[PDB]
Amino acid sequence: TIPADDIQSAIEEYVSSFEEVGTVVDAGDGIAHVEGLPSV
Amino acid sequence: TTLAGELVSVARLLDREAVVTRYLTVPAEDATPRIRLIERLVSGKVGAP
């Protein structure tokens, strides 16, 4: 079995997903990286 | 044995299309969009377990 190559649809409604506390992943010397926050 | 047959090609697809592998990999908190992603993809493909 294999999908009918409709993965682009699955992803586009995965972001039709559209409570937002990003988490710090790295930190040091006045620069941080934040994961999450899809609407910043 | 059919869990094998199922899951191995599940892995096949997930490997060859890494693009949505990324999206179902993003460690954001609520999995619900991602569980919807994977099941919307392959629910009618597989057995329940």
mmCIF file of N, CA and C in Angstrom:
data_model
loop_
_atom_site.group_PDB
_atom_site.id
_atom_site.type_symbol
_atom_site.label_atom_id
_atom_site.label_comp_id
_atom_site.label_asym_id
_atom_site.label_seq_id
_atom_site.Cartn_x
_atom_site.Cartn_y
_atom_site.Cartn_z
ATOM 1 N N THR A 1 0.825 -1.202 0.000
ATOM 2 C CA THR A 1 0.000 0.000 0.000
ATOM 3 C C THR A 1 0.865 1.260 0.000
ATOM 4 N N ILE A 2 0.278 2.355 -0.471
ATOM 5 C CA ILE A 2 0.961 3.637 -0.616
ATOM 6 C C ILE A 2 -0.109 4.702 -0.829
ATOM 7 N N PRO A 3 0.001 5.874 -0.204
ATOM 8 C CA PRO A 3 -0.990 6.923 -0.459
ATOM 9 C C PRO A 3 -0.967 7.352 -1.916
ATOM 10 N N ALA A 4 -2.050 8.005 -2.348
ATOM 11 C CA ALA A 4 -2.129 8.496 -3.744
ATOM 12 C C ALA A 4 -1.374 9.824 -3.866
ATOM 13 N N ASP A 5 -0.222 9.940 -3.197
ATOM 14 C CA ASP A 5 0.608 11.173 -3.290
ATOM 15 C C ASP A 5 -0.235 12.396 -2.915
ATOM 16 N N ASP A 6 -1.078 12.273 -1.885
ATOM 17 C CA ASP A 6 -1.900 13.422 -1.416
ATOM 18 C C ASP A 6 -1.270 13.984 -0.139
ATOM 19 N N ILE A 7 0.036 13.773 0.045
ATOM 20 C CA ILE A 7 0.711 14.223 1.258
ATOM 21 C C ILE A 7 0.671 15.740 1.375
ATOM 22 N N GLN A 8 0.741 16.446 0.244
ATOM 23 C CA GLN A 8 0.680 17.904 0.280
ATOM 24 C C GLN A 8 -0.619 18.378 0.923
ATOM 25 N N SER A 9 -1.722 17.675 0.653
ATOM 26 C CA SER A 9 -2.979 17.999 1.316
ATOM 27 C C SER A 9 -2.878 17.778 2.818
ATOM 28 N N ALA A 10 -2.386 16.604 3.226
ATOM 29 C CA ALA A 10 -2.239 16.307 4.646
ATOM 30 C C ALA A 10 -1.451 17.402 5.353
ATOM 31 N N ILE A 11 -0.369 17.878 4.733
ATOM 32 C CA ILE A 11 0.452 18.900 5.379
ATOM 33 C C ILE A 11 -0.271 20.245 5.409
ATOM 34 N N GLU A 12 -0.944 20.607 4.319
ATOM 35 C CA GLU A 12 -1.599 21.907 4.271
ATOM 36 C C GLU A 12 -2.744 21.991 5.271
ATOM 37 N N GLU A 13 -3.409 20.875 5.587
ATOM 38 C CA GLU A 13 -4.389 20.989 6.666
ATOM 39 C C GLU A 13 -3.754 20.750 8.036
ATOM 40 N N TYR A 14 -2.619 20.044 8.090
ATOM 41 C CA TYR A 14 -1.851 20.030 9.330
ATOM 42 C C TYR A 14 -1.535 21.448 9.774
ATOM 43 N N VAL A 15 -1.383 22.360 8.815
ATOM 44 C CA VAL A 15 -1.210 23.762 9.189
ATOM 45 C C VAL A 15 -2.537 24.513 9.113
ATOM 46 N N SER A 16 -3.567 23.898 8.538
ATOM 47 C CA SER A 16 -4.915 24.371 8.835
ATOM 48 C C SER A 16 -5.249 24.206 10.308
ATOM 49 N N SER A 17 -4.403 23.480 11.037
ATOM 50 C CA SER A 17 -4.423 23.521 12.494
ATOM 51 C C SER A 17 -4.710 24.920 13.032
ATOM 52 N N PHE A 18 -3.943 25.911 12.562
ATOM 53 C CA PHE A 18 -4.149 27.322 12.990
ATOM 54 C C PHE A 18 -4.736 27.373 14.404
ATOM 55 N N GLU A 19 -2.699 30.197 24.089
ATOM 56 C CA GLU A 19 -2.008 28.882 24.160
ATOM 57 C C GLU A 19 -0.852 28.864 23.155
ATOM 58 N N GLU A 20 0.235 29.581 23.458
ATOM 59 C CA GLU A 20 1.408 29.635 22.546
ATOM 60 C C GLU A 20 2.647 30.025 23.362
ATOM 61 N N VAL A 21 3.150 29.101 24.187
ATOM 62 C CA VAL A 21 4.336 29.395 25.046
ATOM 63 C C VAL A 21 5.552 28.642 24.494
ATOM 64 N N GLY A 22 6.252 29.235 23.522
ATOM 65 C CA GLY A 22 7.450 28.597 22.943
ATOM 66 C C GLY A 22 8.467 28.247 24.015
ATOM 67 N N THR A 23 9.271 27.204 23.787
ATOM 68 C CA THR A 23 10.262 26.794 24.770
ATOM 69 C C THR A 23 11.654 27.152 24.278
ATOM 70 N N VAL A 24 12.499 27.627 25.188
ATOM 71 C CA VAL A 24 13.879 27.918 24.833
ATOM 72 C C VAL A 24 14.622 26.611 24.605
ATOM 73 N N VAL A 25 15.309 26.505 23.472
ATOM 74 C CA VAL A 25 16.117 25.335 23.165
ATOM 75 C C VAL A 25 17.596 25.585 23.440
ATOM 76 N N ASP A 26 18.132 26.728 23.021
ATOM 77 C CA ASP A 26 19.506 27.108 23.311
ATOM 78 C C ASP A 26 19.523 28.478 23.967
ATOM 79 N N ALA A 27 20.628 28.785 24.640
ATOM 80 C CA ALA A 27 20.780 30.089 25.262
ATOM 81 C C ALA A 27 22.252 30.349 25.528
ATOM 82 N N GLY A 28 22.671 31.589 25.307
ATOM 83 C CA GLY A 28 24.005 32.013 25.671
ATOM 84 C C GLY A 28 24.430 33.298 24.995
ATOM 85 N N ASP A 29 25.035 34.196 25.772
ATOM 86 C CA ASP A 29 25.549 35.472 25.276
ATOM 87 C C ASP A 29 24.454 36.295 24.600
ATOM 88 N N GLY A 30 23.365 36.516 25.328
ATOM 89 C CA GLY A 30 22.317 37.415 24.893
ATOM 90 C C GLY A 30 21.518 36.969 23.693
ATOM 91 N N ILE A 31 21.603 35.703 23.303
ATOM 92 C CA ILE A 31 20.877 35.194 22.147
ATOM 93 C C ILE A 31 20.245 33.866 22.525
ATOM 94 N N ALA A 32 18.947 33.738 22.287
ATOM 95 C CA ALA A 32 18.233 32.505 22.559
ATOM 96 C C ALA A 32 17.573 32.010 21.283
ATOM 97 N N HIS A 33 17.270 30.720 21.255
ATOM 98 C CA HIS A 33 16.466 30.135 20.198
ATOM 99 C C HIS A 33 15.214 29.551 20.824
ATOM 100 N N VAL A 34 14.068 29.827 20.211
ATOM 101 C CA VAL A 34 12.770 29.489 20.775
ATOM 102 C C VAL A 34 12.062 28.558 19.808
ATOM 103 N N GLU A 35 11.610 27.419 20.304
ATOM 104 C CA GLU A 35 10.846 26.484 19.504
ATOM 105 C C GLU A 35 9.360 26.643 19.782
ATOM 106 N N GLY A 36 8.558 26.462 18.741
ATOM 107 C CA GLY A 36 7.133 26.674 18.840
ATOM 108 C C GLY A 36 6.786 28.021 18.256
ATOM 109 N N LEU A 37 5.778 28.676 18.817
ATOM 110 C CA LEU A 37 5.377 30.010 18.393
ATOM 111 C C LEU A 37 5.177 30.059 16.884
ATOM 112 N N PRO A 38 4.194 29.342 16.332
ATOM 113 C CA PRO A 38 4.055 29.299 14.870
ATOM 114 C C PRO A 38 3.535 30.586 14.264
ATOM 115 N N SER A 39 3.057 31.530 15.073
ATOM 116 C CA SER A 39 2.409 32.732 14.565
ATOM 117 C C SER A 39 3.152 34.006 14.949
ATOM 118 N N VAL A 40 4.429 33.910 15.318
ATOM 119 C CA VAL A 40 5.172 35.112 15.668
ATOM 120 C C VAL A 40 5.498 35.899 14.407
ATOM 121 N N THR B 1 2.616 -10.606 12.327
ATOM 122 C CA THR B 1 3.340 -10.662 11.053
ATOM 123 C C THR B 1 2.807 -9.609 10.085
ATOM 124 N N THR B 2 1.496 -9.370 10.098
ATOM 125 C CA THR B 2 0.974 -8.260 9.323
ATOM 126 C C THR B 2 1.242 -6.926 9.999
ATOM 127 N N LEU B 3 1.473 -6.898 11.312
ATOM 128 C CA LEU B 3 1.976 -5.655 11.888
ATOM 129 C C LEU B 3 3.336 -5.321 11.297
ATOM 130 N N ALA B 4 4.174 -6.332 11.105
ATOM 131 C CA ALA B 4 5.385 -6.140 10.316
ATOM 132 C C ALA B 4 5.053 -5.591 8.934
ATOM 133 N N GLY B 5 4.227 -6.322 8.182
ATOM 134 C CA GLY B 5 3.975 -5.941 6.799
ATOM 135 C C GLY B 5 3.498 -4.507 6.679
ATOM 136 N N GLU B 6 2.619 -4.098 7.595
ATOM 137 C CA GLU B 6 2.162 -2.721 7.752
ATOM 138 C C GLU B 6 3.314 -1.766 8.048
ATOM 139 N N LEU B 7 3.979 -1.980 9.183
ATOM 140 C CA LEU B 7 4.866 -0.981 9.751
ATOM 141 C C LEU B 7 6.123 -0.805 8.915
ATOM 142 N N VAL B 8 6.583 -1.865 8.253
ATOM 143 C CA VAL B 8 7.825 -1.764 7.496
ATOM 144 C C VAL B 8 7.665 -0.827 6.314
ATOM 145 N N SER B 9 6.526 -0.877 5.624
ATOM 146 C CA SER B 9 6.351 0.057 4.521
ATOM 147 C C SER B 9 5.896 1.414 5.038
ATOM 148 N N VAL B 10 5.288 1.444 6.228
ATOM 149 C CA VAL B 10 5.132 2.721 6.914
ATOM 150 C C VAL B 10 6.476 3.414 7.017
ATOM 151 N N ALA B 11 7.501 2.661 7.419
ATOM 152 C CA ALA B 11 8.847 3.211 7.524
ATOM 153 C C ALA B 11 9.413 3.543 6.148
ATOM 154 N N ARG B 12 9.175 2.669 5.169
ATOM 155 C CA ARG B 12 9.597 2.954 3.800
ATOM 156 C C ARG B 12 9.123 4.328 3.354
ATOM 157 N N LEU B 13 7.809 4.552 3.384
ATOM 158 C CA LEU B 13 7.290 5.849 2.973
ATOM 159 C C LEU B 13 7.884 6.966 3.818
ATOM 160 N N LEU B 14 7.845 6.827 5.147
ATOM 161 C CA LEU B 14 8.346 7.903 5.999
ATOM 162 C C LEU B 14 9.791 8.256 5.673
ATOM 163 N N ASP B 15 10.565 7.285 5.195
ATOM 164 C CA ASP B 15 11.955 7.559 4.861
ATOM 165 C C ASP B 15 12.063 8.295 3.535
ATOM 166 N N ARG B 16 11.319 7.842 2.520
ATOM 167 C CA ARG B 16 11.519 8.397 1.180
ATOM 168 C C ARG B 16 10.908 9.790 1.048
ATOM 169 N N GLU B 17 9.817 10.063 1.763
ATOM 170 C CA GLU B 17 9.335 11.442 1.877
ATOM 171 C C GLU B 17 9.678 12.037 3.246
ATOM 172 N N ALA B 18 10.881 12.611 3.342
ATOM 173 C CA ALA B 18 11.326 13.169 4.618
ATOM 174 C C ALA B 18 10.613 14.476 4.929
ATOM 175 N N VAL B 19 9.939 15.054 3.931
ATOM 176 C CA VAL B 19 9.347 16.380 4.101
ATOM 177 C C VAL B 19 8.277 16.360 5.188
ATOM 178 N N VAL B 20 7.350 15.402 5.119
ATOM 179 C CA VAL B 20 6.307 15.339 6.137
ATOM 180 C C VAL B 20 6.815 14.595 7.361
ATOM 181 N N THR B 21 7.877 13.801 7.205
ATOM 182 C CA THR B 21 8.589 13.292 8.371
ATOM 183 C C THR B 21 8.996 14.429 9.291
ATOM 184 N N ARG B 22 9.531 15.509 8.719
ATOM 185 C CA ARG B 22 9.855 16.697 9.501
ATOM 186 C C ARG B 22 8.638 17.203 10.269
ATOM 187 N N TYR B 23 7.496 17.320 9.588
ATOM 188 C CA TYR B 23 6.331 17.950 10.202
ATOM 189 C C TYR B 23 5.734 17.076 11.297
ATOM 190 N N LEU B 24 5.729 15.758 11.100
ATOM 191 C CA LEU B 24 5.300 14.886 12.186
ATOM 192 C C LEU B 24 6.407 14.677 13.205
ATOM 193 N N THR B 25 7.548 15.349 13.019
ATOM 194 C CA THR B 25 8.680 15.230 13.983
ATOM 195 C C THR B 25 8.775 16.473 14.871
ATOM 196 N N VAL B 26 8.222 17.607 14.435
ATOM 197 C CA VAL B 26 8.392 18.860 15.174
ATOM 198 C C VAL B 26 7.846 18.718 16.592
ATOM 199 N N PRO B 27 8.689 18.907 17.596
ATOM 200 C CA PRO B 27 8.316 18.541 18.970
ATOM 201 C C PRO B 27 7.399 19.527 19.684
ATOM 202 N N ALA B 28 6.651 20.345 18.945
ATOM 203 C CA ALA B 28 5.593 21.148 19.551
ATOM 204 C C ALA B 28 4.698 20.297 20.452
ATOM 205 N N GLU B 29 4.007 20.960 21.384
ATOM 206 C CA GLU B 29 3.394 20.262 22.513
ATOM 207 C C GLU B 29 2.214 19.375 22.115
ATOM 208 N N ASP B 30 1.112 19.952 21.633
ATOM 209 C CA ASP B 30 -0.098 19.162 21.383
ATOM 210 C C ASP B 30 0.072 18.343 20.104
ATOM 211 N N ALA B 31 0.140 17.024 20.297
ATOM 212 C CA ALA B 31 0.352 16.112 19.184
ATOM 213 C C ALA B 31 -0.858 16.044 18.266
ATOM 214 N N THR B 32 -2.036 16.450 18.753
ATOM 215 C CA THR B 32 -3.309 16.241 18.065
ATOM 216 C C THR B 32 -3.256 16.614 16.583
ATOM 217 N N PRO B 33 -2.693 17.765 16.195
ATOM 218 C CA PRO B 33 -2.517 18.007 14.756
ATOM 219 C C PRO B 33 -1.657 16.957 14.076
ATOM 220 N N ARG B 34 -0.636 16.428 14.752
ATOM 221 C CA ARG B 34 0.238 15.447 14.114
ATOM 222 C C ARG B 34 -0.392 14.057 14.074
ATOM 223 N N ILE B 35 -1.116 13.672 15.127
ATOM 224 C CA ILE B 35 -1.845 12.410 15.081
ATOM 225 C C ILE B 35 -2.914 12.478 14.004
ATOM 226 N N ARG B 36 -3.567 13.637 13.864
ATOM 227 C CA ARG B 36 -4.491 13.832 12.757
ATOM 228 C C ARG B 36 -3.765 13.710 11.429
ATOM 229 N N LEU B 37 -2.567 14.289 11.334
ATOM 230 C CA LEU B 37 -1.767 14.167 10.119
ATOM 231 C C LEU B 37 -1.566 12.706 9.738
ATOM 232 N N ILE B 38 -1.005 11.919 10.656
ATOM 233 C CA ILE B 38 -0.624 10.556 10.302
ATOM 234 C C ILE B 38 -1.857 9.689 10.072
ATOM 235 N N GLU B 39 -2.922 9.890 10.854
ATOM 236 C CA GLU B 39 -4.090 9.038 10.667
ATOM 237 C C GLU B 39 -4.875 9.442 9.425
ATOM 238 N N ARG B 40 -5.123 10.739 9.227
ATOM 239 C CA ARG B 40 -5.635 11.222 7.955
ATOM 240 C C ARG B 40 -4.841 10.683 6.777
ATOM 241 N N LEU B 41 -3.530 10.497 6.934
ATOM 242 C CA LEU B 41 -2.753 9.884 5.866
ATOM 243 C C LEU B 41 -3.118 8.419 5.686
ATOM 244 N N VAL B 42 -2.942 7.616 6.732
ATOM 245 C CA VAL B 42 -2.896 6.175 6.521
ATOM 246 C C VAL B 42 -3.876 5.373 7.371
ATOM 247 N N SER B 43 -5.044 5.926 7.702
ATOM 248 C CA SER B 43 -6.022 5.167 8.471
ATOM 249 C C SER B 43 -6.612 4.041 7.635
ATOM 250 N N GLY B 44 -7.134 4.373 6.453
ATOM 251 C CA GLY B 44 -7.670 3.374 5.541
ATOM 252 C C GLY B 44 -6.625 2.483 4.899
ATOM 253 N N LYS B 45 -5.361 2.618 5.308
ATOM 254 C CA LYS B 45 -4.244 1.831 4.804
ATOM 255 C C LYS B 45 -3.936 0.603 5.655
ATOM 256 N N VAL B 46 -4.302 0.609 6.943
ATOM 257 C CA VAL B 46 -3.689 -0.269 7.932
ATOM 258 C C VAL B 46 -4.740 -0.849 8.869
ATOM 259 N N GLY B 47 -4.284 -1.749 9.737
ATOM 260 C CA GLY B 47 -5.109 -2.190 10.851
ATOM 261 C C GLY B 47 -4.968 -1.246 12.034
ATOM 262 N N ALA B 48 -5.918 -1.337 12.961
ATOM 263 C CA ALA B 48 -5.992 -0.390 14.072
ATOM 264 C C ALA B 48 -4.744 -0.320 14.951
ATOM 265 N N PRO B 49 -4.158 -1.431 15.417
ATOM 266 C CA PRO B 49 -3.034 -1.310 16.362
ATOM 267 C C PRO B 49 -1.863 -0.516 15.805
#
